[model samples]
Target: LTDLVEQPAKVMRIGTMIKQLLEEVRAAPLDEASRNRLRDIHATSIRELEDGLAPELREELDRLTLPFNEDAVPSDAELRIAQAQLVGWLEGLFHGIQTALFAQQMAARAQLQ
Candidate 1:
């Protein structure tokens, strides 16, 4: 029952987060400046990305880094991939959240009846 309250908040959080991420993703195409600027500034500085990088992805990250991380700039297209991946996951996430919460709603309804 308490978990039911969490359901709405969780969904809203995903909604809010995705929209903010989506807004940035949408803006990247028109504003090439932030696209390149954001990548260069963020690429190396966010060391958290360095943590838990996989073998394949780590290699890719390093290559992405070798240029943009320290020397060159990056692109909006690359930025879009990240948001694109995030969007796909959140859709899967929202569906599961709704499904589980629907079951919980039924359980609570049984109690009420």
Candidate 2:
């Protein structure tokens, strides 16, 4: 999708905005833990944008956008089945993201170095 390629730039812009906000946050003399939390959120969002911009993700998005079948149009049942499978795949992906984010947050707390 054309939108996918552009998303990285948008995300980077948001990161810049967050950095500016953090400068204000720092000026207010917040506690170290709060500053660290904000830093972690900003870093994770930037990493997510990077992952979105990866070549493999781009390729997969392109493949998903392509025509499903060349020979003939699918029947209603066939289309429904395909749609269900796509939904399941998307659910799994989001689940994986959730699991990864939880793990990362836990590790960040544990290290605390």
Candidate 3:
């Protein structure tokens, strides 16, 4: 079992899973309806991240806009841009978490030596 507070490796694995899911969605030739569904799925996953991650990380994630417009079907270019922005945000979140975990480990090691 892995606790988020104690296990950086588990957090990294979850981040990898999220990235893989994003890539799969990006590669799929989804129609507008499907895109809307995908947007919902992404939003759900993001909510989970918000709940599970640190509050600071959640604050950063809160800035990301959900990709689909309810009023109109988005163009492929717009969808692509949204997806790219989301991927960038996820990457930044993961990097920040990993960096903090590394620093924590280093601090622990220094105290032990």
Candidate 4:
């Protein structure tokens, strides 16, 4: 039989946030080339995250398409660890996007100077 299991809300929230970030990148005001590059990178990151988790957990993660809706999503210290890993993934995406933008801006500035 195929494996089937649901993730805790903690995991779901994390997955949701990552998905939302990727969506935001896809929708950002970027040139065709830049948009395509970001899309590829986002897709790669998603694939990595999906493959890193268990098969069932990965499926649950794949199903999350929207940002979490509530503040009270994660509860307790134990679950906080799982939530933290999710936050780390989201933070990495945030920083990576920012770094890409900064590098592009710097190159533009170099051309001007």
Candidate 5:
């Protein structure tokens, strides 16, 4: 029971960190290397989360990829749209995880009672 609770807590922490990193990346004026690093960081985190997810949820996530441009620099509008898309996906992912965590907690409480 304690082990089950701890896993969700750790996931919550990772989700929080991912959210913070996204916000930081959005606010910063980063060089190409920095931008790539941040993008890679975000992608890796999402991949890790996806790996642990059930197949259906992972499939949904697979449809959403990090927006990237290789040949040319993206315009402000393009960047804005990409940021919005990324945030939207993150919001959805976080909501699903939190909802499951809440359900687990409720179930555990009921069992204990």
Candidate 6:
């Protein structure tokens, strides 16, 4: 319900880009300290986005990490892969939220006789 949520993707004024930032996360072979930092931030993001959605949706989200399970992964590779997976989920979730929130404007504009 903030400006960011309601704001359309009309302008992007970032350098290098979030695309590049994410690529770096997956591309770089992170050290222990770096991995911890990324993990902490991503966990926070998961929680934030978890709360941002409906309970059912969040439940579905948790289910996506089955079999492998979030905690049962290989400490290094799967751990990092899960980080990448969760980030993309967050990205995709926000994309849906954006469209849902701003869809009202689309309808309004169409009927703004």
List the candidate 1 regions with Cα displacement exceeding 4 Å.
Answer: 1-15, 27-32, 40-71
Model 4 CA deviation exceeding 4 Å by range: 1-77
Ranking by lDDT: 3, 5, 6, 1, 2, 4
Please name the candidate that would achieve the greatest TM-score relative to the true structure: 3
lDDT per model, in order? Answer: 0.52, 0.49, 0.61, 0.48, 0.60, 0.54
Identify the superior model by lDDT, candidate 2 or candidate 3.
3
In candidate 6, stretches whose alpha carbon ends up further than 4 angstroms from where it belongs are 1-21, 36-41, 66-76
Q: What clash count goes with each model? A: 0, 0, 0, 0, 0, 0
Measured with C-alpha atoms, the lDDT of residue 109 in candidate 3 is 98
Q: Candidate 2, clashing residue pairs?
A: none
- Lowest lDDT sum, 10 consecutive residues, model 6, at 7-16
RMSD versus native structure for model 6: 6.3
Candidate ranking (TM-score, best to worst)? 3, 5, 6, 1, 2, 4
Q: Which wins on lDDT, candidate 5 or candidate 6?
A: 5
Task: Give the per-residue lDDT of model 2 (tens digit) for 24-111.
Answer: 5535555546544544544454445445454765466446533335344444344334334434444554566567769988999999
Per-residue CA lDDT of model 5 for 34-94, tens digit only, reads 6666555655666666644556656666776654655555543445455556567656766
lDDT of 6 at 63: 84
Tens-digit per-residue lDDT, 7-81, candidate 4: 334334546665565455445444546544434444455565664455855756567523322333322332333
- Runs with alpha carbons beyond 4 Å of true place in candidate 5: 1-7, 66-87, 93-113
| Global fold similarity of model 3 (TM-score) | 0.59
| Tens digit of per-residue lDDT, candidate 1, span 1-113 | 23223344544554455447657767536465666665643443324343433345445545544334434344566666554554554465467657877998899999999
What is candidate 3's lDDT per residue for 42-78, written digit by digit as tens? 5565665566666655666576565356667665556
Model 4 sits at a Cα RMSD from the real structure of: 17.2
Instruction: Candidate 3: give the clashing pairs.
Output: none
